[PDB]
């Protein structure tokens with residue numbers, strides 16, 4: 001499905017059993033989700049960098065589905081003003097920049 | 100073209116007569132560029148807003164070159180961690196997200 005950008009690219013993803021919204025942010029290396037409780041282990045990682053660093057929880061192979069696109073990928077879990085799907089995951093679903 | 104996303108969508112624009120490095124940021128509403136002595140009139144528009152706001156100069160309908168695509172569009176000028184090409188300037192260039 002082609003998504004014009006006249007509006008903020010916010011699609012729905014299915015994670016940890018729950019349903020949430022997420023912006024297809026390409027200027028994002030990583031994927032950060034608003035506090036959740038994914039099982040499995042994780043590691044603590046720091047992101048941001050401007051204004052200090054924000055620490056979150058790194059998870060791996062955390063299954064995730066995007067617009068029906070079942071996929072697997074690293075999901076940083078912590079405090080973000082809006083759930084965001086970075087390139088790390090966009091590259092796993094086939095998403096490309098086209099013009 | 101078809102810009103995959105394993106790397107960061109950095110493309111060579113051509114604003115103000117010079118040549119630059121800009122990141123195609125879908126999650127980005129507007130386009131802000133670190134200093135470019137831009138002619139004509141502008142006006143104060145605060146962007147960002149976390150940890151406080153930030154003032155950049157808004158010059159409307161500004162000509163810009165993006166990968167051989169010539170267009171016109173609002174481009175805010177000021178202190179920005181990187182040169183970003185937001186949705187406003189991606190729509191005008193007919194750029195889309197696909198998967």
Ligand SMILES: Nc1cccc(CN2C(=O)N(Cc3cccc(N)c3)[C@H](Cc3ccccc3)[C@H](O)[C@@H](O)[C@H]2Cc2ccccc2)c1
Nearest residue numbers: 025027028029082084126127128129130131146147148180
């Ligand atoms: N007009 C305009 C100018 C610049 C940027 C944007 C758009 N955004 C950003 O670029 N972000 C800040 C931003 C902007 C420029 C550089 C950086 N590093 C961050 C991060 C994306 C992000 C990038 C890199 C790592 C993690 C997250 C945020 O997660 C996104 O939701 C939006 C949300 C947003 C933030 C501030 C103001 C309005 C809307 C719009």
